Each structure stands twice: as C-alpha cells, then as structure tokens.
C-alpha cells in the first residue's frame, strides 16, 4: 500500500485532454469564477449605484460598452466580501455595491497564480526548463500593478480599471489627462517592448517562411515538415546573409534569437508596471520644469509638450463631474477651459 | 511652434514640425520659397523629409 | 594560494555592442528627465 | 533653459559607468588565449 497523497498525485497527473495537476485545484475554480463573474455582471448587473451608469446587456449596453464596474469611492479599499459588513450576506445588495469587482479581481489574481504554478508543474513533468512560467511574470506584474497596487495607492477601488471594453478606454484617457502617462519613460519602455515584440514576431515568422528548404513537391509547403525530423526546416545561413545585406546586422545564433524574443516584450511589460506603481502615488512624469519656467515668462514660447498639457487640462475639466460623481463637482459653463469657437 | 533642441526643446519635447495649414496639400519644395528663412517659417523641412522618407 | 572555484569571465563583441546600445539608448531616453 | 544642474553629471555617469564596465570585460576577453 502506497499513501493517499501519492495516490491523489497519480490521479491529479493523469494524462487527459485537460491536464489538471495540483495547480488545477487553485487554477480551475479561480479562473472559472473570474470569467463567470465577468459574464454574469456584464449580462445582468448595473453600475447605477456605484457610478450612475448602465453596464449590462439587460440595461441595453452592447459588447463594447458593458462592464463590471468598480465599487463606489465611499467603499474605500474594502474587500467587499459577500458576508462582509457592507453587504451582510445579501447577494442582491452585494451586486449593487460592486462586490463583483473585487470578486473578479481577487479570483483573477489567485487564478493567475494558479496558471503560472501550472506552467511550472507541467514543465517539471515533461522535463523542460520553465522559461514559459518566467515569461508569464510580465502579465502578472501588469495585472498586479494596475488592478491592485494602483487603486491601493489611490482613494479607493473606484479608480481601478473597470472590467469592460469602453471602461478600459476610459482608463487610458484618464491616465492621459491626469497623469500625463504618455510622457512617462517607464510607459515608453513598455511601448518599445510591445511594438518591438510584435516586430520580432512578424519578422521572425516571415523570415523562416521565406528561407524554407524545399523538402516536398507541394506548392503548399506546410506538409514538407515532420515534428521528429532532426534537420532545420529553413536556412539560417541564407536568412543571415539576407538580413546582413538588407539591414546591416542579422542574428547568427538561434538560441540568442529565441531568448531575445522572450526578453523584449517581458522586459517592456515589467517597465510599464514600475511606472504604474509610481502613478499609484501620483508620482508622475507630468512636467518638465524648465519648459514651465520658460513658458510662464515667455508667452511666445510653444512646444508640443505645452500643447499636450492644454489637452490634459480640457480632459480633466470636462470629464471629472461625470467620471467622479462622489466629488459632486459643479463647474459653471464660465469656468470650463475652451479655445476659440469650440 | 518650437521643435528643435537649440530653440528650447529636449529629446522628449522636440520635433520636426509639420508644414503650415496655409499651404494645405500644396507642394512646397525649397525652390517655391522666396528664401530659406521663409521656407523654415512655413515648415518646409517636414515635407522634404516625409516625401523622401516614404519614397525611400 | 589556488582557489579552485575561480572561472574566467567573458563578453564577446556582439554583447559589447548590444550593451552599449542599451546604455546609450537608456541615456538618450532618461537624460531629458534628468535635466528636467 | 533652467535645467537641473545635476542633470549633466547624472547623464554622464549613467553612460560612462556601465559602458566602461562592458569595455573592461570585452577587452580582457579578446586578450585571452
């Protein structure tokens, strides 16, 4: 007789259509609830009491405008547990108070933990090095910095991103108007890692596809590859000459190439997360002090930097009353910043 | 609008500034201007750059 | 004498070029913020 | 432009310290047998 632990291990690690593992016990329920909570809220649940918005298919929103919205600002950073002191076990009230926001965010966080544990668990069983798990630390750093740390630095969960297509767009535009987030060099490194990653994805796929060896008679060339073949399916030597002559440099080491493909977009996302930790605290790259000194003293001095600040000032004044309803802002028409005519 | 480093910009604020709205889509090579001074005022470098770049 | 844990260190030419590009580019990016 | 006075030294060390680190390592790699 072997022990119960070992017997459970066998059963968890059976080769099946959907691998389970010990990681599966955390992953599956948290992932399923995050996803089901989003589908439930966007289909049926309002944001009238937290934001004064309609947010579900039931109320008439479409796939672009539905969301599970954050709780009201007066909730602070309450966990907002179903059985907690705000909802007191009342499911209907819980929904109305934004309890599904924290439900989705916390189950989503535990689910991401479970997914990366899955990546380690499978890598170990199959006998590979766990670089895929390591790469997944980027999406984690992003989710944690943006959905958790950022609102924890601010007044409340209200200012986290709400889970929806249009809601996220709103989160972008808020970040431009309030934080001048485009000016932030940690964001800029994120952009370079994402666009550089997409560049590498396209250029590498295209290069292999255009330096293939003729290994078949088909004009459709996909069949002329066998997974167990020992030989390279495309010519590294020819690819290298091409890029050396076109661009001036080229990869010559395939291991370096593939490592660099991990490095670029993972590093970029990590840089962007560091910037958002700063924004949690309003510690922005908002201004260039020297620009401000000059512009204040010299009314003929103008740059694209000073122009963008005028846009931000417009965004804040025009959006804040409806976007921040707990502030009870009333901005008389006469105080609103506007240029001529418009 | 000041775009260049020597006229008060840094790397993040600097730019080559697009050609004047008074020009519109009119072709504004160097030889259409009465002088380099005019050409610079009206954003001639932008058109020379972008047309040679898109062709290249 | 003789510590057997010693190992030579290396940095190939390509790595030098990559590292210098990283440094210079970071400097070109961050310098505006340092001057402020 | 009234820039920060430490901006120059900060930028200069930011470039030079790691760059020289790399140069040191490169040259002593070439001089190996």
């Amino acid at each position: 007789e072997r022990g119960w632990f070992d017997i459970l291990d066998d059963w968890l690690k059976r080769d099946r259509f959907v691998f389970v593992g010990w990681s599966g016990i955390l992953l599956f329920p948290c992932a399923y609830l995050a996803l089901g909570g989003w589908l439930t809220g966007t289909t049926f649940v309002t944001s009238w009491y937290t934001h004064g918005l309609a947010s579900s298919y039931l109320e008439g929103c479409n796939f672009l405008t539905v969301a599970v919205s954050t709780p009201a600002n007066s909730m602070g950073h309450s966990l907002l547990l179903l059985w907690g002191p705000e909802a007191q076990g009342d499911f209907t009230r819980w929904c109305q108070l934004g309890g599904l926001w924290t439900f989705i965010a916390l189950h989503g966080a535990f689910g991401l933990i479970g997914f990366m544990l899955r990546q380690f668990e499978i890598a170990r069983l199959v006998g590979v090095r766990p670089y895929n798990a390591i790469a997944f630390s980027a999406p984690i750093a992003v989710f944690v910095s943006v959905f958790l740390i950022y609102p924890l630095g601010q007044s409340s969960w209200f200012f986290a991103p709400s889970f929806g297509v249009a809601a996220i767009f709103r989160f972008l535009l808020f970040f431009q108007g309030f934080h001048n987030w485009t000016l932030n060099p940690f964001h800029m490194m994120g952009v370079a890692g994402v666009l550089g990653g997409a560049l590498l994805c396209a250029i590498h796929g295209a290069t292999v596809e255009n330096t293939l060896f003729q290994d078949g008679e088909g004009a459709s060339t996909f069949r002329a590859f066998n997974p167990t073949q020992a030989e390279e399916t495309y010519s590294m030597v020819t690819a290298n000459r091409f890029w050396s002559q076109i661009f001036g440099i080229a990869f010559s080491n395939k291991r370096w190439l593939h490592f660099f493909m991990l490095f670029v977009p993972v590093t970029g996302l990590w840089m962007s997360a560091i910037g958002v930790v700063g924004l949690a605290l309003n510690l922005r790259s908002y201004d260039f002090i020297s620009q401000e000194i000059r512009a204040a003293e010299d009314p003929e001095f103008e740059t694209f930097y000073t122009k963008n600040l005028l846009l931000n000032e417009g965004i804040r004044a025009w959006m804040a009353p409806q976007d921040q309803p707990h502030e009870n802002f009333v901005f008389p028409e006469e105080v609103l910043p506007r240029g001529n005519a418009l | 609008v000041s775009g260049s480093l020597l006229y008060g910009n840094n790397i993040i604020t600097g730019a080559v500034v697009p050609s004047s709205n008074a020009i519109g889509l009119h072709f504004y090579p160097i030889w259409e201007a009465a002088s380099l001074d005019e050409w610079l005022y009206n954003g001639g470098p932008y058109q020379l750059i972008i047309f040679h770049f898109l062709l290249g | 004498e003789p510590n057997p844990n010693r190992q030579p260190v290396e940095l190939n030419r390509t790595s030098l070029y990559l590292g210098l590009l990283l440094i210079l580019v970071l400097a070109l990016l961050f310098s505006s913020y340092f001057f402020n | 432009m009234e820039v920060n006075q430490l901006g120059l030294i900060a930028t200069a060390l930011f470039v030079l310290v790691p760059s020289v680190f790399l140069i040191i390592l490169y040259v002593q790699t070439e001089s190996q047998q």
Binding site: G248, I249 | - | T14, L20, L21, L24 | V15
Partner: peptide, 30 residues
C-alpha cells in the same frame, strides 16, 4: 550644455551603428 549632451549621445549611437555593422564579429559557417 543640454543640447550638446543630447547630440553627443546621438552621435555615439550613430558611431556604434557603423562599428556594429562594418566591424562585426563575422558569422562563420564552420
């Protein structure tokens, strides 16, 4: 000072491009 600094870094990057291209480690097939 700032303009000289930004131009100097740029010029170094352009020089690095020249060495990385024409004084590269040659790819060796053997």
């Amino acid at each position: 000072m700032e303009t000289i600094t930004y131009v100097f870094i740029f010029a170094c990057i352009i020089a690095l491009f020249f060495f990385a291209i024409f004084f590269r480690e040659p790819p060796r097939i053997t």
